[PDB]
Amino acid sequence: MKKEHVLHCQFSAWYPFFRGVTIKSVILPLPQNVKDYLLDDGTLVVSGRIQWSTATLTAPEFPEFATKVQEAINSLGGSVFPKLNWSAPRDAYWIAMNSSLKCKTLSDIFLLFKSSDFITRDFTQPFIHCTDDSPDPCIEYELVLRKWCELIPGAEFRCFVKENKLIGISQRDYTQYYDHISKQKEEIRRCIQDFFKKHIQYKFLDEDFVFDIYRDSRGKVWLIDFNPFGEVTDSLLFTWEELISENNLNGDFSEVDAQEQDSPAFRCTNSEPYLSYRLPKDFDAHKLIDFLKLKRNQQEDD
Amino acid sequence: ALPEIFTELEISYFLLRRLLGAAKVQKLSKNEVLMVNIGSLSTGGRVSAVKADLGKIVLTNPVCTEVGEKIALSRRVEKHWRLIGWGQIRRGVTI
Numbered sequence A: 001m002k003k004e005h006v007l008h009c010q011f012s013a014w015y016p017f018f019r020g021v022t023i024k025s026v027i028l029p030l031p032q033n034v035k036d037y038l039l040d041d042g043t044l045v046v047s048g049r050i051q052w053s054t055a056t057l058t059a060p061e062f063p064e065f066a067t068k069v070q071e072a073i074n075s076l077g078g079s080v081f082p083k084l085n086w087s088a089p090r091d092a093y094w095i096a097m098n099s100s101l102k103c104k105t106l107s108d109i110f111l112l113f114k115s116s117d118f119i120t121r122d123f124t125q126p127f128i129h130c131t132d133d134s135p136d137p138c139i140e141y142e143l144v145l146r147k148w149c150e151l152i153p154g155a156e157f158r159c160f161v162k163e164n165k166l167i168g169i170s171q172r173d174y175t176q177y178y179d180h181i182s183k184q185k186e187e188i189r190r191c192i193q194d195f196f197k198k199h200i201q202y203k204f205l206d207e208d209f210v211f212d213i214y215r216d217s218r219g220k221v222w223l224i225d226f227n228p229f230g231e232v233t234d235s236l237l238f239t240w241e242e243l244i245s246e247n248n249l250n251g252d253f254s255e256v257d258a259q260e261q262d263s264p265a266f267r268c269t270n271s272e273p274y275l276s277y278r279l280p281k282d283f284d285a286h287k288l289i290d291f292l293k294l295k296r297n298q299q300e301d302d
Numbered sequence B: 001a002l003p004e005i006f007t008e009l010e011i012s013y014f015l016l017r018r019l020l021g022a023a024k025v026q027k028l029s030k031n032e033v034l035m036v037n038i039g040s041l042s043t044g045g046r047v048s049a050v051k052a053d054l055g056k057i058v059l060t061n062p063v064c065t066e067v068g069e070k071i072a073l074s075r076r077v078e079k080h081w082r083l084i085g086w087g088q089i090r091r092g093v094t095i
C-alpha cells in the first residue's frame, strides 16, 4: 500500500467523479489559522460559542470562515455531517449534544473535531501503514460538509475490491445483530453487485480499494466513502490475510447453500473497538478512581 | 441520591501533580472542556467556576446521574485525552 493510494481516498480526489451516487457535499479548504487551531497541543477551548470568588481562556475567532461555513451548511439544508480529508469524528460522538455528529454551525464541528482522535490522525499520521520509501506528500487540508441523513440502522455495508473484482461484502456494524439482514441477504448482495458494476468498477483511481455503501428504505444503494485497501481500513468480518491471500473467501458450502461462483463473499452477523472512543489514552469507574487516589498520594511523596 | 438528568455539576475535584506514565498538570482554567467519565458514560465539561477544591462544569451533553457519584477528569494534551484527576458531585442543575 503506497502513499498514492491514501491520497486517492481524500474526499476531494474522488467526489467529483461520483457526485451522482453519493451524498451531496460541500468541500472547503482549511484556512492556515483554522488549521493551526485544530492542531493546538493545549487544552480544548471551543471557537465560535457557596461564594464563588483563575484564568479565563478564549479560543481564536474566525468570523469570515464561520460565515462561509454557515452559508455552506444552509446550502445543504441546515444540517450537515462533517469530516476532514479522510476521517469523520465518529469517536467523539459522546461529547456532542444528543451524542450526535449532526452539526448546524461551525462551533458544533469544532467541538467534535478537537475531541476526535480520528481527526488527529488525519493531521499527524495520514500515511501510517504505508509501505513506501518516498517522502510524505504535502496535504492540503479541507473541511467536508455532507448533507445530514437519518440513516436506518443496519443498512451500511463495506465492500472490498481487489484488481477491479468485488471479493467481499461485510456488514459495517458487525458487532450488532440485525434480523432483517439474513432475511434480505440475497436481495442485498445483488443490489450491491449491480451498483458496483454500473457505477463503481473501473471508475475509481485504483484497482484495489474499499468502498462503503448505504442501502436506503427503498432498496437504493448509495456510495458513502472510499478507503485504502490495506491495514488502515477496518476489515470488519474479514481479515486482511484472507482478502489479500488469493484464497476462496466464500468458505465450505454445498451445492444447496451455494450461489454463483463469481459472487463475492457476503458476511453479516449471526444470532448473538468502539468503547475506547469515550475513554482516555491512559484508560466500572470505581476501580479507576481508587487508582487515581493512589497515584495522587505517590506523586506527592516523590 | 435520586437519579436525575443533569446539565451542570458542582463538584469536589482533585488533580494529579503529573500525567501518568512527566508533564505537570495545569490548574483548572475557565472555558476549557474536559472529558468526564461518569460510570459507563462520558461527556464534556466546560469549566465555568473554580476554587481550590471546588469546581463547576457546564456539560456539553446532559447525563443521568446523582449527587455523590464520582467522576474521572481528562484534559486534551498534545491532541490526546489524558487523565488529570477525579471528582465527586456535590450539587447540580437539573432539567
Ligand SMILES: Nc1ncnc2c1ncn2[C@@H]1O[C@H](COP(=O)(O)OP(=O)(O)OP(=O)(O)O)[C@@H](O)[C@H]1O
Binding pocket: A023, A081, A086, A087, A088, A089, A090, A146, A147, A148, A149, A150, A151, A156, A172, A212, A224, A225, A227, A233, A234
Ligand atoms: N450524510 C450522512 N448523514 C448521516 N450519517 C452519515 C452520513 N454519511 C455517513 N454517515 C454515518 O457516518 C459513518 C461514517 O461515514 P464515512 O464512511 O463517510 O466515514 P469514515 O470516517 O471515512 O469511515 P471509517 O472510519 O469507517 O473508515 C457511516 O457509517 C454512517 O453511519
